[PDB]
């Protein structure tokens, strides 16, 4: 008929318990395609899935999952921070050390693709920003206007990033704390 008595929500309840079982059930009944552009076009598209469960998926050590994360980045000119926040809005940034690296490696290599010095420069810049959207709630002193610049010294090979850039960056996230 014209209706759609299609599951596609049971898979959602399943993905939120087990990502590996959820993204396979959908492919079992024929709702989700194979490859990686399908699955990556699912975590990014269908926003009704736990953000912690989506953020843990793409930050998995699997060689099939690392591909499932690269296609995720390859979907979504603008300010650097205007890209970090956009990257981190779809999921809950995972607190695991090895996972954060897997994400900021592909985000820095994808940005530096379409000021700065290398992809390693955006890489460490991304982390200083995550070291500021988390810093700006139980601490009396905040990150100094004088600091954060003296602290980020030596990020372009041997030199600093324009002090006007780190400043324009500072004022943005202290107003709107991405996450």
Structure explained in plain terms:
- With 179 residues, the chain is mainly α.
- The protein folds into two domains: 1-76, Annexin V, domain 1 (Orthogonal Bundle); 77-179, Arf Nucleotide-binding Site Opener,domain 2 (Arf Nucleotide-binding Site Opener, domain 2), CATH 1.10.1000.11.
- It is built from nine helices and no strands.
- It has helices spanning 10-15, 19-29, 40-43, 51-55, 67-73, 81-87, 97-111, 119-130, 163-173.
- α7 (97-111) crosses α8.
- It is elongated.
- The relative contact order is 0.09.
- Homodimer. Interacts with ARFGEF1/BIG1; both proteins are probably part of the same or very similar macromolecular complexes. Interacts with PRKAR1A, PRKAR2A, PRKAR1B, PRKAR2B, PPP1CC, PDE3A, TNFRSF1A, MYCBP and EXOC7. Interacts with GABRB1, GABRB2 and GABRB3.
- The modification Phosphoserine is found at residue 61.
- It comes from Homo sapiens.
- This is Brefeldin A-inhibited guanine nucleotide-exchange protein 2.
- It is found in: Cytoplasm; Membrane; Golgi apparatus; Cytoplasm, Perinuclear region.
- The PDB classes it as nucleotide-binding protein, metal-binding protein.
């Amino acid at each position: 008929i014209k209706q759609q008595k299609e599951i596609i929500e049971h898979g959602i309840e399943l993905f939120n318990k087990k990502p590996k079982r959820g993204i396979q059930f959908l492919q079992e009944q024929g709702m989700l395609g194979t490859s990686v552009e399908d699955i990556a076009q699912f975590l990014h598209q269908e926003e009704r899935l736990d953000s912690t469960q989506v953020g843990d998926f793409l930050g998995d050590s699997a060689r099939f999952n690392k591909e499932v994360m690269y296609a995720y980045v390859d979907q979504l000119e603008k300010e650097f921070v205007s890209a970090l926040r956009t990257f981190l809005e779809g999921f809950r940034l995972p607190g695991e050390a090895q996972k954060i690296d897997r994400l900021m490696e592909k985000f820095a290599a994808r940005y530096i693709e379409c000021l700065f010095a290398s992809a390693d420069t955006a890489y460490v810049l991304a982390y200083s920003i995550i070291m500021l959207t988390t810093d700006l709630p139980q601490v009396k002193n905040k990150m100094t206007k004088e600091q954060y610049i003296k602290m980020n010294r030596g990020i372009n090979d041997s030199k600093d990033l324009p002090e006007e850039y780190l400043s324009s960056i500072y004022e943005e996230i202290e107003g709107k704390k991405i996450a």
